[PDB]
Write a protein that binds this ligand. Structure first.
Ligand SMILES: OC[C@H]1O[C@H](Sc2ccc(Cl)c(Cl)c2)[C@H](O)[C@@H](n2cc(-c3cc(F)c(F)c(F)c3)nn2)[C@H]1O
Length: 138
């Protein structure tokens, strides 16, 4: 439906209580997906499901500053499945981004980029059919 890579502007950046919801379907034989919450050229929060990293499925999260990736945060719970519809919910909390997939909490990512109001774009890329991307204040 929506063209991927997709850019969702986040006017005035993010703030606690802002909820971003992404609906889509993983393509068959998917290799990767990425959500990039950007501050200009920096990536404040990169959320990156990898479907085949040495025959393992893993979600890699990181921050990119001045074109350098930092320390990766990895955990082993992988709720996505090739060919299946998903819902990602990213809730901005005062100290971290809180992520739920298909209504189940997945992970938290502590804020490395501190100027939340300058994280003004969300890029969505990878092996998905993107249905919708929106935000609301809870
Ligand atoms: O840490 C996270 C980064 O890890 C490597 S670079 C690297 C390698 C080793 C280490 Cl120890 C470190 Cl710290 C960094 C990736 O190449 C990088 N990356 C992924 C994508 C990308 C682009 C897409 F278009 C897309 F659809 C997609 F799903 C993904 N672009 N850039 C990013 O995931």
């Amino acid at each position: 439906m929506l063209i991927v890579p997709y850019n969702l502007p986040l006017p005035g950046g993010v703030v606690p209580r802002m909820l971003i919801t992404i609906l889509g379907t993983v393509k068959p034989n998917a290799n990767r997906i990425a959500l990039d919450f950007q501050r200009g050229n920096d990536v404040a929060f990169h959320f990156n499901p990898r479907f085949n990293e040495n025959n393992r499925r893993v979600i890699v999260c990181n921050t990119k500053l001045d074109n350098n990736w930092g320390r990766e945060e990895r955990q082993s719970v992988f709720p996505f499945e090739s060919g299946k519809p998903f819902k990602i919910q990213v809730l901005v909390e005062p100290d971290h981004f809180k992520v739920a997939v298909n209504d189940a909490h997945l992970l938290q990512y502590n804020h490395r980029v501190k100027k939340l109001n300058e994280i003004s774009k969300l890029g969505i890329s990878g092996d998905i059919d993107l249905t919708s991307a929106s935000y609301t204040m809870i």
